[PDB]
Amino acid sequence: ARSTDTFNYATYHTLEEIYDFLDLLVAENPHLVSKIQIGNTYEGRPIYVLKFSTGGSKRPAIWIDTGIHSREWVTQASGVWFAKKITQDYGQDAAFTAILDTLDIFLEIVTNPDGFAFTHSTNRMWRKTRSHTAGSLCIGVDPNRNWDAGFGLSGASSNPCSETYHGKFANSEVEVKSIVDFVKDHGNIKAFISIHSYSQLLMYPYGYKTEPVPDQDELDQLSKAAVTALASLYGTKFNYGSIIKAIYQASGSTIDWTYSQGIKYSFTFELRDTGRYGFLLPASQIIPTAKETWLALLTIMEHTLNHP
Ligand SMILES: C[C@@H](C[C@H](C[C@@H](CCC(=O)O)C(=O)O)C(=O)O)C(=O)O
Ligand SMILES: [Zn+2]
Secondary structure: OOOOOOOOOOOOOOHHHHHHHHHHHHHHOOOOEEEEEEEEOOOOOEEEEEEEOOOOOOOOEEEEEEOOOOOOHHHHHHHHHHHHHHHHHOOOOHHHHHHHOOOEEEEEOOOOHHHHHHHHHOOOOOOOOOOOOOOOOOOOOOHHHOOOOOOOOOOOEOOOOOOOEOOOOOOOOHHHHHHHHHHHHHOOEEEEEEEEEOOOEEEEOOOOOOOOOOOHHHHHHHHHHHHHHHHHHHOOOOEEEEHHHHOOOOOOOHHHHHHHOOOOEEEEEEEOOOOOOOOOOOHHHHHHHHHHHHHHHHHHHHHHHOOO
16 A cells, blocks of 8 residues: 555455555665566566565575466465565564575566456456467467477467467567576576466476476475475465376476476466365455465475575
């Protein structure tokens, strides 16, 4: 509202309200938080990433994104909560302070702004970007099928109208290319966590093929530790495994690409629930979802911190 302390974290917000929150959080924490514009969407909206840092030069970092699929509202709502949580816990909570004293955190709360705006104005269930496709009347590309990892292979659709349309070519969507450019420019991302809903799952590579990733044992043990931490709060049960075994085959997905780039701790979350409400999760579950998810994120960040 007028400050991030008066902001209502227990309700769903519009794009403008979240963008205003970004500016308020930065103004209130000028030496801890920075707002970086990594690009502009298809429709021209700025794409923002929040940088949380306590100093250093090109420190190893954790990347977290929410809302790549616009209709998964509990993710952007959780992202806003995570942002505030970082500013509340740094310097107060021993464990988190340790994390941020060595690692920087980059958080993209609304990874698909055009889609988010559309879920408020026209279609609550919109998933894709809002770009046009030459030769078609159908709008949008599935941003989670647009990455250059098994691009265009089984696990994606070539039909522009499909919810899983992969696009003309890898990185065709500016929302995806902006992240790709950022990751390459930064060059020191150690963990990359892309958050979705729903299903209650914590997954690692790969989604496009059944071959296990070289670091399967470590990532699987880390996943078990993370879901155990998550369950400790409210008892919420999450299953885990590779994308392909835990949910289904998906090509051109984010973490298959980030992992191929050398970011070992590449994970994707599927938050509450398992389908009762699905994408339409009640607002009263935003904070509980964010709180339990944060415990799992802390598990991954600490593991990352301790395995340089
Ligand atoms: C329940 C949801 C699952 C779906 C899974 C997701 C693959 C797994 C992941 O990257 O988290 C995908 O892009 O299809 C999602 O969160 O977009 C859906 O059916 O849209
Ligand atoms: Zn999704």
